[PDB]
């Protein structure tokens, strides 16, 4: 059985002065130490995140997959590369540059490294073009942020994008980014612990309660990061509301929990009971191993949590291999 990890990120070699050529405050670039082993994602002139080789260097990444026992890894852009706020033609350009970088990275060993495209989502026309092009060019689908400022997934532009992908049999992974919280969550990585899972839950819900899933064709393949946030756990609150308020029910014809057959989630929930509640709510067919490699708060032993749970033989196979094979049409 081949182990598949479908949530991992990369960042290419981009010089400071080139990030500038797009935007001197918000275009990210990669400062690497001369040692070669480490560096940081930068932002204008500011440190954004400490990183290490496996992020940019595909050769190095292979050992680490050998070491982890990971055969096939589907990887994508680091969310900070998204460029969703920017002027649209630069973002469309930026995306095309990055999705090419990504193809290269994978070319090192295209059998074992698969990529996902980023798109200039603030512009529906350019975004569908990049989606279609980049999948022509090798990508197995797209990764988008869960929202566009105060447009959430129920917005018509975002729905139309999912609908473009649906119609072209292009899979989508949705990653939270640009977290709500303004000024309250500056210490202890709260943005990662509180805002992020709520962000993701809210992507799922914006689609459910807006009646979006009645409009998007049933053939869409859409997956949600980090177990779909707290979605599964708060699903009962959601149904309850739905049953007792017209305003909650107005746009959503079926109970919200009936819609769990319309998307997938990854496995990264960091706890045996959570994963089980998750697989319980979602079904063993809709969960995929993702690790969030190679970041500090990803699963440092990939598959560990699944490999050693109270779970089905076939279910574990589905989660570590089966599900993702189909979702991404990876020839097992």
Number of Cβ within 10 Å of residue 153's Cβ equals 23
Which letter does DSSP use for residue 283 in this model?
-
150 is in an annotated binding site: no
Tell me which residue of 1, 118, 103, 9 sits closest to 61, measured CA to CA. 9
Number of Cβ within 10 Å of residue 69's Cβ equals 12
Q: Which residue has the tokens 């990061």?
A: 225
Which of 159, 199, 292, 299: binder of Co ion (CB under 5 A)? 292
Nearer to Co ion, 23 or 292 (CB): 292
237 binds, among its own copies, Co ion, none (CB under 5 to 8 A by kind): its own copies
329 binds, among Co ion, its own copies, none (CB under 5 to 8 A by kind): none
Nearer to Co ion, 159 or 266 (CB): 266
Regarding 251 and contact with its own copies (CB under 8 A), the answer is yes
Q: Within 270-329, which residues bind its own copies (CB under 8 A)?
A: 270-271, 273-274, 277, 280-281, 296-297, 299-300
Task: State both tokens at 165.
Answer: 């992908």
Q: Within 175-214, which residues bind its own copies (CB under 8 A)?
A: 180-185, 187-190, 192-195, 197-198, 201-202, 205-206, 209-210
Tell me which residue of 15, 151, 11 sits closest to 80, measured CA to CA. 11
Q: Please, what is the minimum distance in Å from the beta carbon of residue 24 to its own copies?
A: 27
292 binds, among Co ion, its own copies, none (CB under 5 to 8 A by kind): Co ion
Tell me which residue of 203, 176, 207, 171 sits closest to 192, measured CA to CA. 176
180 contact partners, CB below 8 Å, separation of at least 6 = 195, 198, 199
Task: Tell me how far apart the alpha carbons of residues 173 and 171 are, in angstroms, rounded to a whole number.
Answer: 7
Q: Residue 145 half-sphere exposure, CB side, CA atoms within 13 Å? A: 23
Regarding 154 and contact with Co ion (CB under 5 A), the answer is no
Can you state the angle between helices 196-209 and 231-244, rounded to 10 degrees? 40
Binding region for Fe(3+): 7, 9, 175, 292
Binding region: 7, 9, 175, 292
Residues that bind its own copies (CB under 8 A): 147, 150, 152, 154, 180-185, 187-190, 192-195, 197-198, 201-202, 205-206, 209-210, 226, 230, 232-241, 244-245, 247-248, 250-252, 269-271, 273-274, 277, 280-281, 296-297, 299-300
Residues that bind Co ion (CB under 5 A): 292
């Amino acid at each position: 059985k081949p182990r598949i990890d479908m949530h991992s990120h990369f960042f290419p070699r981009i010089s400071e002065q080139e990030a500038a050529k797009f935007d001197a405050n918000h275009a990210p670039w990669l400062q690497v130490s001369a040692k070669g082993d480490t560096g940081s994602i930068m932002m204008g002139k500011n440190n954004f995140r400490p990183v290490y080789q496996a992020l940019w260097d595909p050769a190095f990444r292979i050992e680490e997959m050998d070491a982890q026992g990971v055969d096939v890894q589907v990887t994508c852009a680091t969310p900070v590369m998204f460029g969703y706020t920017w002027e649209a033609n630069k973002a469309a350009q930026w995306a095309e540059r990055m999705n090419d970088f990504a193809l290269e990275f994978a070319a090192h060993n295209p059998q074992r490294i698969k990529v996902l495209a980023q798109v200039p989502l603030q512009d529906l026309d350019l975004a569908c073009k990049e989606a279609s092009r980049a999948v022509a060019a090798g990508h197995l689908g797209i990764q988008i942020g869960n929202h566009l400022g105060d447009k959430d997934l129920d917005d018509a532009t975002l729905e139309a994008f999912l609908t473009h992908c649906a119609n072209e049999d292009i899979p989508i992974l949705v990653h939270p980014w640009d977290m709500m919280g303004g000024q309250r969550m500056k210490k202890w990585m709260l943005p990662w612990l509180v805002a992020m899972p709520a962000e993701t839950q809210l992507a799922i819900l914006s689609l459910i309660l807006s009646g979006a899933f009645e409009r998007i064709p049933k053939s869409l393949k859409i997956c949600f990061g980090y177990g779909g946030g707290s979605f599964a756990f708060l699903l009962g609150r959601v149904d309850n509301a739905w049953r007792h308020r017209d305003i909650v029910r107005e746009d959503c014809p079926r109970p919200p929990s009936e819609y769990v057959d319309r998307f997938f989630v990854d496995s990264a929930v960091f706890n045996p009971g959570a994963l089980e509640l998750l697989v319980s709510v979602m079904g063993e067919d809709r969960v995929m191993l993702g690790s969030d490699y190679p970041f500090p708060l990803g699963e440092q032993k990939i598959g560990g949590l699944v490999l050693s749970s109270n779970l089905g033989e076939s279910a574990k196979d589905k989660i570590i291999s089966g599900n993702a094979s189909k979702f991404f049409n990876i020839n097992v």
